[PDB]
């Protein structure tokens, strides 16, 4: 037992030494010659109303016209963002929802929460209604985020240190990922649809490969828990936020930390993070009752998109990159460009 | 208008959905939500009987609709999940009396720590608590042979049931630190009739009256 612990400590020291030897130059000394974006301002173009309680998640479609939103009233709504209309309203069985997803083929949606069950709904039928296609069960805690991998494969992460991959048609798990110690809060699929990364309540993140099931790599460094993770457009980076008023930029190949986004006047929490269509703007949702826009390569700018009367809890960006949607606890949803 | 027929049909659809949503939401703000809490094996099963994931129980009493939520099945950290209960009318807390000597560090001190952590939480600075003390028969039949100094050295009172009950109740109620904003109600868990629901009905009526008056700056 002692020999195993000594070997583990030696391996950790060797990994740290290799990482230190792999760090030669920093990007903070390269972007000093880059012209900044300058002042960036945005204006409310539409305002979507109809929700009553808070808003916990939202997700864009694959064509940048249709929208999905989930509230604590046990309500799911499908909107059109070009004319401010309602295309569908879906009821729910459990009013405690914390995540949603939109199928890339425009056919299915998903919901989940504190009931430990993931519900999958089918949109296009012959009777004109929306029906409950599947109920996936097998977790023991609570679901935090669900994404559609393809039209017949789904991925879930829970608060039992477990991530799972499901085959919808069968109804049964095909692979399970374990190795965390605390709650898991986020995951973000890659464009090539072969890997995914997840962050835990223990100031750590892990990168996983789907086909095999073996944990690929582990990153640490935050002072406290990690609450939001997004994923870079090219598939070779990601950025995370903690409940410490701090954001970080990690890479999957250099195996080290790159940039830190923090400021002395910010002492609240971070609830969501997203990128832009060219990897030049980073949008963050804080608890100061406003959002923020960061220059992803220079790590200094504070272009507040204020306008909410409570905490901003979700945001998203279109596929063509021509709008930004924000949702907060004030029961309204706003569109920016 | 400058629209085709199909767009007019679309806006009619949207208006109809809006009406349905408003009706449902208005019908959904006419009910009482209570959150249950207690220590491990505190007898709260008796409370549920007399009246995985989240367990939701429903009942209707004297023209009110009560939703009780039981959260005992969860085992994760309570910090990242407790915020979704900001709008509750009341927190029910259940504590055991006949577990002062059993050590798991007895049960009484763990219950005290849990109460002191819950009552001063930031999300619950205006939410009332209903406190149940239960398992009193074994308590009355246990102090005839065991002294209260086994866990309360400072106690110097009579070896009678009433003095013990009063001391325990005052010790618990002394934990509050927001005396000007929210109250605390106490009751000994009965086992012979339907008082355990009447007490909650009275508590929620009083909470409604005080919220109504204090929302008007009166």
């Amino acid at each position, epitope marked *: 037992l002692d020999q195993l612990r000594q070997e583990a400590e030696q391996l950790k020291n060797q990994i740290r030494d290799a990482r230190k030897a792999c760090a030669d130059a920093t990007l903070s000394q390269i972007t000093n010659n880059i012209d900044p974006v300058g002042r960036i301002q945005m204006r409310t173009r539409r305002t979507l109303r109809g929700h009553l309680a808070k808003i916990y998640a939202m997700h864009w479609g694959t064509d940048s016209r249709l929208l999905v939103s989930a509230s604590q009233d046990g309500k799911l709504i499908i909107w059109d963002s070009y004319t401010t209309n309602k295309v569908h309203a879906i009821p729910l069985r459990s009013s405690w929802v914390m995540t949603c997803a939109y199928a890339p083929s425009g056919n299915y949606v998903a919901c989940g929460g504190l009931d430990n069950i993931c519900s999958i709904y089918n949109l296009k039928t012959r009777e004109g*209604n929306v029906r409950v296609s599947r109920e996936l069960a097998g977790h023991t805690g609570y679901l935090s985020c669900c994404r559609f991998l393809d039209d017949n494969q789904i991925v879930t992460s829970s608060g039992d240190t477990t991530c799972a991959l499901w085959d919808i048609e069968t109804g049964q798990q095909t692979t399970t990922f374990t190795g965390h110690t605390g709650d898991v809060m986020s995951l973000s699929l890659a464009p090539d649809t072969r890997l995914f990364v997840s962050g835990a309540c223990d100031a750590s993140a892990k990168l996983w490969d789907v086909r095999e099931g073996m944990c690929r790599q582990t990153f640490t460094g935050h002072e406290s828990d990690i609450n939001a993770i997004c994923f870079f457009p090219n598939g070779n980076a990601f950025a995370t936020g903690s409940d410490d008023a701090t954001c970080r930029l990690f890479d999957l190949r250099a195996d080290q930390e790159l940039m830190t986004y923090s400021h002395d006047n910010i002492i609240c929490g971070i609830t969501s993070v997203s990128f832009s269509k060219s990897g030049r703007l980073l949008l963050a949702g804080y608890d100061d009752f406003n959002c923020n826009v960061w220059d992803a390569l220079k790590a200094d700018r504070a272009g507040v998109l204020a306008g909410h009367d409570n905490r901003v809890s979700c945001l998203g960006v279109t596929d063509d990159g021509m709008a930004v949607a924000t949702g907060s606890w004030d029961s309204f949803l706003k569109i920016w460009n | 208008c*400058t629209l085709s027929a199909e767009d007019k049909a679309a806006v009619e659809r949207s208006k*109809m959905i809006d009406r349905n949503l408003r009706e449902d939401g208005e019908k959904a703000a006419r009910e009482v939500k209570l959150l249950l809490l207690g220590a491990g094996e505190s007898g709260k099963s008796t409370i549920v009987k007399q009246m995985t994931g989240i367990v939701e129980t429903h009942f209707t009493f004297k023209d009110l609709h009560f939703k009780m939520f039981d959260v005992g099945a969860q085992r994760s950290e309570r910090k990242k999940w407790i915020h979704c209960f900001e709008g509750v009318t009341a927190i029910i807390f259940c504590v055991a009396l006949s577990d002062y000597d059993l050590v798991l560090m007895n049960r009484m001190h763990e219950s005290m720590k849990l109460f002191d952590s819950i009552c001063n939480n930031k999300w619950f600075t205006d939410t009332s608590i209903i406190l149940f003390l239960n398992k009193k028969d074994l308590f009355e039949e246990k102090i005839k042979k065991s002294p209260l100094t086994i866990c309360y050295p400072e106690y110097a009172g009579s070896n009678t049931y009433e003095e013990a009950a009063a001391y325990i109740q005052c010790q618990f109620e002394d934990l509050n630190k927001r005396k000007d904003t929210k109250e605390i109600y106490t009751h000994f868990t009965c086992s012979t009739d339907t008082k355990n629901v009447q007490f909650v009905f009275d508590a929620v009526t009083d909470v409604i009256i005080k919220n109504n008056l204090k929302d008007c700056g009166l």
Partner: single-chain antibody
Amino acid sequence: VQLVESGGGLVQPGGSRKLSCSASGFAFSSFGMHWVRQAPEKGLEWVAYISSGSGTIYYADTVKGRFTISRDDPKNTLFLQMTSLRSEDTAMYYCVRSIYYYGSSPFDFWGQGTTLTVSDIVMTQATSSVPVTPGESVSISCRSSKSLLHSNGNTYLYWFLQRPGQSPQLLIYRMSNLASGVPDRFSGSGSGTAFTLTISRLEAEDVGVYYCMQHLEYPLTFGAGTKLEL
């Protein structure tokens, strides 16, 4: 999904007649309902429209004020009532569904029609018969009188088919799309005010009468019909 109509018959001049439609197998409270007419040996003709919520009711420019349209939602029944019938209303009638939101496909399911016997942008079909041979490519074109590309970017022409002794089924909706249950060997395109449909690799059960409609604004106008025969 099954709509069945009833009520047809023989009537003397004048009098009255009520026709009913019964639905089974879908949500009758999210679909608007049209009545369409077909002459004994001519093209189709638009008649009436009733919508979701009973808010909007249109009528024909010919017999307005003489026809009565109504719906009953809990029992799922659609009613038409007519009085004082002349000789111009000896024909067959069809009930059609439509639902309008972003992405839908109107005029999807038709009925079986009923028979009644009594003792405006211009659509004109170019031809009347085209003899063909299996394995050949066919183009069928019709014409209009004003532009159909609405400002928002749509296009509102409909291409329908009819085989012998049957009821129509939607081939192309909004002049460029493909419906459900239809073989993937069809196409349709047009240059403003004149349009053409293309069929490749002909086969049996693909011979009959083709029709082209508009829906830019009420009322809607029909054509004579193109007969494709072997």
